[PDB]
Amino acid sequence: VMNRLILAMDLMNRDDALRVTGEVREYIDTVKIGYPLVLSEGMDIIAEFRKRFGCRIIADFAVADIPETNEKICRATFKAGADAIIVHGFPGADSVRACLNVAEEMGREVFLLTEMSHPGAEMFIQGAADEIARMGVDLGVKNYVGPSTRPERLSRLREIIGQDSFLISPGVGAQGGDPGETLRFADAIIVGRSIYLADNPAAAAAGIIESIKDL
Amino acid sequence: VMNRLILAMDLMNRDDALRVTGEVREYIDTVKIGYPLVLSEGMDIIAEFRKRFGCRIIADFAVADIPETNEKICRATFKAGADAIIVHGFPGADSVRACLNVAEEMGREVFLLTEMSHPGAEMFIQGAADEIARMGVDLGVKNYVGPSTRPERLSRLREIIGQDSFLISPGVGAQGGDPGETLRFADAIIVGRSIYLADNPAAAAAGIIESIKDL
Numbered sequence: 256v257m258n259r260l261i262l263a264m265d266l267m268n269r270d271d272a273l274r275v276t277g278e279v280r281e282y283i284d285t286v287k288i289g290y291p292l293v294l295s296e297g298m299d300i301i302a303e304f305r306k307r308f309g310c311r312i313i314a315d316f317a318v319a320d321i322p323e324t325n326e327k328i329c330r331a332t333f334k335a336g337a338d339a340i341i342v343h344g345f346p347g348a349d350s351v352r353a354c355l356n357v358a359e360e361m362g363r364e365v366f367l368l369t370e371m372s373h374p375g376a377e378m379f380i381q382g383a384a385d386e387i388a389r390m391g392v393d394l395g396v397k398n399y400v401g402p403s404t405r406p407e408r409l410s411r412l413r414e415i416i417g418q419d420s421f422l423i424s425p426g427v428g429a430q431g432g433d434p435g436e437t438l439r440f441a442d443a444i445i446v447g448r449s450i451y452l453a454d455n456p457a458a459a460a461a462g463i464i465e466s467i468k469d470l
Numbered sequence: 471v472m473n474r475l476i477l478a479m480d481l482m483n484r485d486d487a488l489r490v491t492g493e494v495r496e497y498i499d500t501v502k503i504g505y506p507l508v509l510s511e512g513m514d515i516i517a518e519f520r521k522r523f524g525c526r527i528i529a530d531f532a533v534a535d536i537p538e539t540n541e542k543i544c545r546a547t548f549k550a551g552a553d554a555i556i557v558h559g560f561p562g563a564d565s566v567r568a569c570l571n572v573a574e575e576m577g578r579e580v581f582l583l584t585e586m587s588h589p590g591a592e593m594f595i596q597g598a599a600d601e602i603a604r605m606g607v608d609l610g611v612k613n614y615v616g617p618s619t620r621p622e623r624l625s626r627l628r629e630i631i632g633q634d635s636f637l638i639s640p641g642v643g644a645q646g647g648d649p650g651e652t653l654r655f656a657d658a659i660i661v662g663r664s665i666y667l668a669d670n671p672a673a674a675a676a677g678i679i680e681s682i683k684d685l
């Protein structure tokens with residue numbers, strides 16, 4: 256992805272989300288849109304962004320339901336124009352496979368969320384995360400999400416998935432993660448608040464990128 | 471809830487969802503709306519149903535993100551008129567607490583999803599589910615979701631949460647669960663396909679209810 260930087264656009268107002276995304280578009284080719292924006296402004300926001308900005312859109316829907324419901328969510332999401340969808344692995348292999356099947360049908364991609372970045376991830380997800388990643392490998396998943404806040408975990412994830420899999424990583428900036436350290440293991444970093452709450456989002460993005468280029 | 475039966479309205483077309491819900495409304499007072507319908511028709515569908523049918527709406531959004539994102543999802547969902555939201559416990563206590571805080575702010579309810587009903591739930595969720603339920607109890611959660619497909623698990627869940635907590639249970643009918651057995655432990659059952667794919671949804675609902683009344 257451009258500059259190895261993915262914007263997490265979690266503003267909840269269309270006007271603010273369009274302003275910030277336009278201001279930083281010279282520095283990214285990929286925007287992650289989640290439920291904060293979609294549930295406030297509608298699924299049509301995905302195609303609007305995709306067209307306006309000529310970006311890739313990752314729908315961060317943390318998909319975490321039974322196979323039949325996951326199927327439906329994925330189909331609605333790809334019908335709305337998303338390039339990829341983020342799926343939890345904790346519901347197990349049939350739930351993941353359901354999403355992979357729809358992505359295969361519709362020519363899209365699944366990202367498997369393996370271990371989360373926030374403190375509560377230590378309670379239950381972290382102990383399962385290596386197995387969740389191995390399950391991904393055995394299902395043929397090629398794209399993964401793991402935590403900037405724990406680069407030792409992010410290194411173990413990378414070890415499981417191999418060098419050819421694509422790994423993106425949230426938790427940079429606001430949550431405490433570091434761009435450069437995270438990019439030792441991840442292919443791209445996700446950044447939300449450190450850019451979209453900045454007084455100058457373009458300057459915030461540019462500053463991050465200047466630290467990425469130095470790598 | 472009326473007749474201890476909650477409709478899972480996972481049709482993806484507004485006209486079909488309104489037809490079926492209207493046909494079975496004499497038999498329920500509570501509809502569960504999830505992402506299949508909301509991502510196809512918009513969040514406005516919640517208030518439309520709530521008003522048209524004078525039902526309670528549970529937003530089944532399987533909320534499974536970091537605390538700050540969960541906050542945003544909950545606020546958008548309650549702003550849309552939902553009475554309650556379903557939240558995963560697997561992301562840990564801070565993610566759950568974030569949802570509880572918004573519900574307290576907005577006079578709404580959280581349901582904690584503890585153990586899922588599909589086969590893949592055995593991989594990772596089932597081994598954590600008793601702890602997830604105990605975490606719920608220690609956070610003050612009063613409403614829970616557990617699986618009709620495993621009534622021995624559903625009994626253990628009930629044992630943890632006590633007799634005063636409210637427990638609802640999906641997996642009845644299509645997934646193999648039985649109404650009467652499930653209602654030995656759950657206060658209400660969730661039913662989707664066995665009603666909404668039936669040639670006569672009202673007759674399907676009535677048949678289920680006639681088996682519930684016999685209990």
Ligand SMILES: CCOC(=O)c1cc(=O)[nH]c(=O)n1[C@@H]1O[C@H](COP(=O)(O)O)[C@@H](O)[C@H]1O
Pocket residue numbers: 263265289315316317341368370371372373400402425426427428429430445446447448449534535536539
């Ligand atoms: C939960 C599914 O989505 C994610 O991508 C995600 C997983 C995770 O472990 N950590 C994480 O922060 N994210 C998401 O990535 C974004 C992080 O934004 P920020 O902390 O503001 O830089 C935000 O949308 C959050 O919901």
Ligand SMILES: CCOC(=O)c1cc(=O)[nH]c(=O)n1[C@@H]1O[C@H](COP(=O)(O)O)[C@@H](O)[C@H]1O
Pocket residue numbers: 319320321324478480504530531532556583585586587588615617640641642643644645660661662663664
């Ligand atoms: C995943 C969050 O939501 C749920 O309520 C849920 C959890 C679970 O373990 N099992 C389960 O079936 N559900 C939901 O409950 C509904 C079951 O519908 P059905 O099987 O058609 O009777 C459906 O919306 C499904 O997504």
